[PDB]
Amino acid sequence: MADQLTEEQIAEFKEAFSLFDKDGDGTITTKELGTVMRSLGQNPTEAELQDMINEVNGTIDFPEFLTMMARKMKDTDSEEEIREAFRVFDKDGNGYISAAELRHVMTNLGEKLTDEEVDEMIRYEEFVQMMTA
């Protein structure tokens, strides 16, 4: 699931990975992975380091690094995108002004959807959270 990743994000993370590593391949012991995470600016605890080691004997391959960063940055980007898109519907109102106002935008647009299904699901962010669950 590398599609949730941004081109600039993957470029920056590859740049950091290339700067951290020494001569040779990127496969070094898990202590190197922990130190790279510390240098990247993140605050990974011992449990996060253990999970990253288990995901990847002391070989940090670019695919495994990309996968662990994919899951982490994907959770982070999902949270950030939810927070940003909470204010995406600026035309409906200032903030969650009316249930009918949001329902009109959600039913007149969004996807090929059934008119009665939107009303049934109604009975802003709460609807998105319910749909995600």
Numbering used by the authors: 1 to 56, 61 to 127, 139 to 148
The authors write:
Ryanodine receptors (RyR) are >2-MDa membrane proteins that allow for the release of Ca2+ from the ER and SR, thus mediating a range of Ca2+-dependent processes. Each forms homotetrameric assemblies of ~5000 residue long subunits. Mutations in RyR1, the skeletal muscle isoform, can cause malignant hyperthermia (MH), central core disease (CCD), and other myopathies. Here, a collection of cryoEM structures provides insights into the molecular consequences of MHrelated RyR mutation R615C, and how apoCaM opens RyR1.
Similarly, two classes and corresponding structures were obtained for R615C pRyR1 in the presence of apoCaM, with 69% open, and 19% closed channels. Comparison of the closed WT and R615C pRyR1, both in the presence of apoCaM, shows that the mutation still results in conformational differences. There is a relative tilt between Nsol and Bsol, resulting in shifts ~2–7 Å across the entire Bsol region. As the Bsol interacts with the NTD-A of a neighboring subunit, this results in relative movements of the N-terminal domains, and downward movements of the cytosolic cap overall. Although the pore is closed, it is ~0.8 Å wider for closed R615C, as measured by the position of the Cα atom at Ile4935. Comparing closed channels, the R615C mutation thus still results in a pathological conformation, with partial movements generally linked to channel opening. Indeed, the planar lipid bilayer shows that the Po of R615C remains higher than WT even in the presence of apoCaM. ApoCaM can dampen, but not fully prevent a pathological conformation induced by the mutation, which remains more sensitive to activating ligands than WT. The C-lobe forms interactions with CaMBD1 and CaMBD2, and these do not differ between the open and closed structures of R615C pRyR1:apoCaM. Thus, upon binding, apoCaM pushes the R615C pRyR1 into the same two conformations observed for WT pRyR1, with one corresponding to an open, and the other to a closed channel.
